[PDB]
Amino acid sequence: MKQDSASNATYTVDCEDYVHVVEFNPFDSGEAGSLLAYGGISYVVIASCRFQEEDSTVEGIEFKTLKTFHHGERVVAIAWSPETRCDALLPLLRFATAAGDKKIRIFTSDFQDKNEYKVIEGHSGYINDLVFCSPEGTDIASVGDDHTCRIWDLDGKQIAMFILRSPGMSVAWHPEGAFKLMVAEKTGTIRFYDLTTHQAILSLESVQVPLMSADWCVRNTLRIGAVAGNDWIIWEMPRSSYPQDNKPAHADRARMFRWSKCNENVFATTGYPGKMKSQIAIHHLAHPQPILIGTAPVGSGLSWHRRLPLCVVGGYRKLFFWLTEM
Amino acid sequence: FTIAAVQKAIQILRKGSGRVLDLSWEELRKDVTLTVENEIQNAVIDYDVSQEEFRQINIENWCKFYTCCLQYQETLSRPLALLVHPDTNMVCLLRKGFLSFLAPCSLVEHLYLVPAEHLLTVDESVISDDIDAASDIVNLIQCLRMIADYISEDMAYLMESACCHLQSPERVAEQILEDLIANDIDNIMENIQNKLQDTRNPIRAIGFLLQNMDYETNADMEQPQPNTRLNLSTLYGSITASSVVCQAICKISATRFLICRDLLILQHLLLRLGDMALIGAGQLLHSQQELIPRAAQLLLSYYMIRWGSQCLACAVPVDILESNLQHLSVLELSDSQVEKRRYTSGIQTIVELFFEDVARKHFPHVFIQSGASQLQEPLNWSDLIKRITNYLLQLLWPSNPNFQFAECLMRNCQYTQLQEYVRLLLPWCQVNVGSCHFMLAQCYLVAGEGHKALDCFSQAASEVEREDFLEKLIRVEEGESVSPRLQYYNRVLRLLEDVGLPELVIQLATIAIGEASDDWRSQAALRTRIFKHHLDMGHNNQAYDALTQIPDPSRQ
């Protein structure tokens, strides 16, 4: 008997539709509130979130839907453009989605009448992950079950294609490096590509398979974190191709891994969606056990707030937020 | 393009009787992008456009906008008057839209840019006291121009792309030379060979061009005496003068980049021509082994200065700058009081920003050291612009030990431009490697990439005793015999604590204990710091392990 005291979510917001993915804007939108996107069965909702921890005028959470986009298909992944700004004389909302129809959609909006989307075709399998290039915002990387990593301009033209040895499961741009791309493969291989040389720089191998998610630490560009099988795995580059840490994350497989955007030692993992509840575990590298354990009904997405030690997971028709101490 | 050309081009595309709004540059950029995007959306009649047809429609609409800007620029560029200043010799071209300044060319740019008909009329006595050396330089520059006239736009782009992607410019000059020889329809290689046979010593002429293009400074920039500051601090202090000087650098670096490219291609041609054509078989091969890497380094240095002279500074809010200056003042990287500079909300290049912030404060000294000990000499535009531009080129020089350009970018929160500057510099410049890694580590810390910041801080620690910039970070603790690396790590540890990253503080403090081998007091302080951060994070076992390792019983 240790009653796993599953912590309640710090905040909970009701949604009009099922949440299948959720992503905070990791960029500065120039607004006081953090931009959040969530994808449902046929819609993408863009919202502003303000928290009492960043703004003493808010009691708890202020959640405001800014815009709802008709998407027509189930959204699987969302990526923010670094050009997204709301405080400008001309606000620009730009994000990309991957969906159940194997297409990418780039949405562009002024929050007024100008609402345009571009459809990008070329993936022959499901797209598992997609990301904008952070610093230029001009390019989108995507990975999928067609065993390709593809690079697109905003015009939907394929600039580059890398053939993978298995399904691509996650993709991340180097936080400081416009031409460095991490691609994580389902067989446990994580590869780094240079887009100027079109070459693989280096690879990492997971001690478990399948690898389901990987993330590049923004606060420490030497750290890579992933989930594979039941474990979370951390590497510190360039010191070794072997993992520095490998520890149990979840009993019934780990699904998502994300680094905190404010702390290089904090990350969250999600369990595979069981029939009733997904477990969420917040970890700190100085501790052998999770510092927080939460639960969501059918956990979908995992994202971190830009400034606060606050993570979000979608579940059923709700967003669940967990704040951790720093 | 003038802002007035761009604003007129937008008004016509809009088909709209809108009043000329004095739009900000960011508003103008947003308005251009939205206007071209609306024309692209109007040109897309069908929902099922292929990615390639969409790309082609995008290119065509940008080309239409660009052509519209060119026609308005041509109209605004029409010369109306010449203003010649009698006392200062300043020459000003009054165009319909704008004002240009005429600055005298340096010797190398003059000989390269003069029409071929007039090159034979240049007084050889202006080039060198040695008539034979003057003739060799003129013949060499004719060879460079013959090469320049046959370089296609694709070959010119291939060299510029190679510099951007950090490819060896020597190998790329060899490829362009292969393509030039493969396409030699007009026997130009024979004409270049015939003209090279007229050169008595091509090595001496190449060495002379490289020397006049070299701004590497020996570190004797004497520190300023305080008493003459008050009347000369305002010389060339206007935004108009700042931009004219920075445009002089942009043009000089652009022309000298072309000269270095064409010179590298000519040096590879001289290597291929081999023992068959030039009286000097053994001296040519050995001297070209020293001169080719030098021409490549000058090409990369002028590419960097050209890139920086064209690179726009980011608009930074005053509150973020004041907070960054408070954080840098904790580092003692800032002696300069914030004179309440209203950032005049104009677009500036990173070189214009550097000129106004740093280089300007040193010009009164350059004026005094050069024999102007009489406050009675009349101001001469031609001499002064040349001196200012040469001095600013020395300060912008990538091998400059003072490292002031990168320091100015860090101080003004120009992190993206500083990352790109350091990316372009590190592969080939070995002078300020530690200082580059330290600046890059600070950029990664602001980006939230704390692990990459720690790796870069650890690399910077190796060069701390060699580089004057890193030595400045150490010189203020007048305390007993600590290793300069341990003082540096203590400084980086204070900075990681102020940002609130306890995991990285522990990793760095563990490394710093390895360097503290002989000082039990510093080891006690570092282990107490590791204990505190593990305790704060709740790592009870690691906090207890750290406690057992503390050598001081009182702190334990």
Phi, psi of A17 (to 5 degrees): -130, 170
**Cis peptide bond upstream of A238, omega within 30:** yes
C-alpha to C-alpha distance for B515 and B487, rounded to whole angstroms: 10
B300 Cβ contact list (under 8 Å, min separation 6): B163, B169, B398, B428
Q: What angle do CA A229, A233, A239 make, to 5 degrees?
A: 145
CA distance linking residue A25 with residue A39, whole number of Å: 14
Encoded amino acid at B290, one letter: E
With an 8 Å Cβ cutoff, are B449 and A219 in contact? yes
Which of chain A's residues have a Cβ under 8 Å away from the Cβ of B315? Answer: none
**Among all chains, which residue has been given the structure tokens 């700190």?**
A284
The answer to whether B444 and A175 have CB atoms below 8 angstroms apart is yes
Contact A220 B416 (CB under 8 A): no
**SS3 breakdown of chain A: % helix, strand, coil, rounded to 5?**
0, 55, 45
Whether residues B51 and A88 touch (CB distance < 8 A) is answered with: no
DSSP B217: P
Q: Give whole-number Cα distances, B439 to A177, A261, B316, B435, in Å.
A: 15, 21, 18, 6
Strand arrangement of the beta sheet that strand A189-194 belongs to: A168-174, A177-185, A189-194, A199-205
Tell me the sheet residues that pair with A127: A144
Copy the structure tokens of residue B7: 């604003």
Q: Tell whether B314 is within 8 A of chain A (Cβ).
A: no
Helix or strand (DSSP H, E) at B393: helix B381-396
**Is any Cβ of chain A less than 8 angstroms from the Cβ of B218?**
no
CA distance B410 to chain A (A): 15
- Give the residue among A122, A161, A167 at the shortest CA–CA distance from A147: A167
- The experimental method, as deposited, was cryo-EM
- Asked whether the beta carbons of A190 and A206 are under 8 A apart, the reply is yes
Q: Is B184 an 8 Å CB contact of chain A?
A: no
Chain A with chain B: Cβ pairs closer than 8 A: 119
* Residues of chain B contacting A121 with CB distance shorter than 8 Å: 51
Cβ pair A220:B451 closer than 8 A: yes
From residue B316, give the alpha-carbon distance in Å to each of A155, A262, B321, B323, B414: 30, 21, 7, 11, 8
User: Which DSSP helix (H) or strand (E) runs through A236?
Assistant: strand A231-236
CA angle at B392 for the pair B391 and B393, rounded to the nearest 5°? 90
Cβ–Cβ < 8 Å for A160, A151? yes
Picking from A108, A95, A102, A117, the residue whose alpha carbon sits closest to that of residue A39 is: A95
Give the residue carrying structure tokens 């050209």. B306
Give CA–CA dist B439/B321, Å, rounded: 16
d(CA A40, CA A75): 6
**Separation CA A53–CA A31 (nearest Å):** 16
The SS3 assignment for B325 reads helix
Q: How far apart are CA B390 and CA A260, in angstroms?
A: 48
CA distance readout (Å), B235 to B72, B180, B229, B342, B349: 34, 48, 11, 19, 20
What number of other Cβ atoms are within 10 A of residue B28's Cβ?
17
Which residues of A are less than 8 Å from B30 in CB distance? 88-90, 92
Q: What is the DSSP string of A245-269?
A: EEEE--TT-EEEEEE-SS-TTEEEE
Tell which residue, B529, B495, B485, B497, has the closest CA to residue B510. B529
Contact B451 A175 (CB under 8 A): no
Please indicate if any CB of chain A lies within 8 Å of the CB of B75: no
Strands A61-70 and A231-236: unpaired
Give the span between the Cα atoms of B228 and B54, in whole angstroms.
63
Alpha-carbon Rg of chain B, whole angstroms?
28
User: Cα torsion at A98, A104, A110, A112 (round to 10°)?
Assistant: -80
The DSSP secondary structure of A7-70, one letter per residue, reads: BPPSEEEE-SS--SEEEE--S--SSSSEEEEEE-SSEEEEEEEEETTT-TT-SSEEEEEEEEEE
Question: Where are any strands of DSSP class E within A81-185?
Answer: 93-99, 104-109, 115-120, 127-132, 139-144, 148-153, 158-163, 168-174, 177-185
Q: Search chain A and give the residue with CA nearest B424.
A: A177
Pairing of the two strands A127-132 and A139-144: antiparallel
A181 Cα to chain B: minimum distance (Å): 15
CA pair distance B483, B491, nearest whole angstrom: 13
Report CA B332 to chain centroid distance, whole Å. Answer: 25
C-alpha span between A131 and A141 (Å, rounded): 5
| Token pair 């200065």: residue | B305
- Which residue from B214, B219, B218, B217 is spatially nearest to B299, judged by alpha carbons? B214
R_g of chain A computed on alpha carbons: 18
Who contacts B234 (Cβ-Cβ below 8 Å, separation ≥6)?
none
Q: Cβ–Cβ of B541/A120 closer than 8 Å?
A: no
Compute the distance between CA of residue B89 and CA of residue A278 in angstroms, rounded to an integer: 79
Q: Smallest Cβ distance to A326: which of B54, B500, B506?
A: B500
- Phi-psi label, residue B315: left if phi above 0, alpha if psi -120 to 50, beta otherwise: beta
Distance of alpha carbon B124 from the chain centroid: 34
Instruction: Say if residues A69 and A115 touch (Cβ distance below 8 Å).
Output: yes
CA triple B474-B475-B476, angle to 5 deg: 100
For the record, the structure tokens of A293 come out as 């354990």
Answer whether A125's CB lies under 8 Å from A131's CB: no
Residue corresponding to tokens 């031409």? A179
Asked if the Cβ–Cβ distance from B451 to A153 is below 8 Å, we say no
> Which residue reads 């050995």 in tokens?
B286
CA distance A144 to A102: 9
Asked if residues A296 and A320 have their Cβ atoms less than 8 Å apart, the reply is yes
Give the three-state DSSP class for B71.
helix
Closest to A38 in 3D by CA, of A51, A49, A29, A54: A49
User: Which tokens belong to A257?
Assistant: 């891994």
As a whole number of angstroms, the distance between CA A243 and CA A232 comes to 10
- Nearest-by-CA chain A residue for B443: A176
Euclidean distance between CA atoms B489 and B468, whole angstroms: 17
Task: Return the residues preceding each gap in chain A, C–N over 2.5 A, or none.
Answer: none
For residue A74, give how far its alpha carbon lies from the nearest alpha carbon of chain B (Å).
20
Q: In whole angstroms, give the CA distance from residue B414 to residue B357.
A: 13
- How many Å apart are CA B538 and CA B517, to the nearest integer? 28
Please indicate whether, in this complex, the C-beta atoms of A221 and B34 are within 8 angstroms of each other: no
Do residues B127 and B107 touch, judged by C-beta distance below 8 A?
yes
What resolution in angstroms, rounded to 1 decimal? Answer: 6.9
Cβ contact A220–B34 (<8 Å): no
Question: Which residues of B are less than 8 Å from A118 in CB distance?
Answer: 54
Host H or E run for residue B422: helix B415-425
Nearest CA among B4, B13, B21 for reference residue B72: B4
* Mutation to test the A interface, candidates B503, B508, B532, B541, most A Cβ within 10 Å: B503
DSSP of B336-392: S------------BHHHHHIIIIIHHHHHHHHHHTT--STTSPP-HHHHHHHHHHHH
- Spell out which residues of chain B touch residue A225, defining contact as CB-CB under 8 Å: none
B42 in contact with A, Cβ within 8 Å: no
- Identify all chain B residues contacting A157, using CB atoms and an 8 Å cutoff: 51-52, 54-55
Q: CB of B136 within 8 A of CB of B202?
A: yes
How big, in percent rounded to 5, are the helix, strand and coil portions of chain B? 65, 5, 30
Residues of A with CB under 8 A from a CB of B: 88-90, 92, 108, 114, 116, 118, 120-122, 135, 152-153, 155-158, 175-177, 196-197, 217-223, 236-238, 261-265, 284-288, 291, 326
Distance (Å) from the alpha carbon of B456 to chain A's nearest alpha carbon: 10
Interface contact A219-B52, CB threshold 8 A: no
Which residue among B30, B58, B534 sits closest to A286, beta carbon to beta carbon?
A: B534
Cβ atoms of B399 and B216 within 8 Å: the answer is: yes
Residue of chain B whose alpha carbon sits nearest to that of A289: B539
**How does B410-422 read in b/e, with b if 16+ C-beta sit within 10 Å?**
bbbbbbbbbbbbb
Candidates B307, B306, B295, B305; CA nearest to B173 is B295
Peptide bond into A210 cis (omega under 30): yes
Report the alpha-carbon distance of residue B507 to residue B451 in Å, rounded: 10
CA B329 to CA B336: how far, in whole Å? 10
Task: Measure in Å the smallest separation between the Cα of A284 and chain B Cα atoms.
Answer: 8
B503 and A155 within 8 Å at the Cβ level: the answer is no
Distance CA B230, CA A11 (A): 61
d(CA A109, CA B261) in angstroms, rounded, equals 45
- Sign of CA pseudo-dihedral B125, B130, B131, B132: negative
Instruction: List the Cα angle B450/B452/B457 in 5-degree steps.
Output: 90
Q: Report the gap between the CA of B500 and the closest CA in chain A (Å).
A: 8
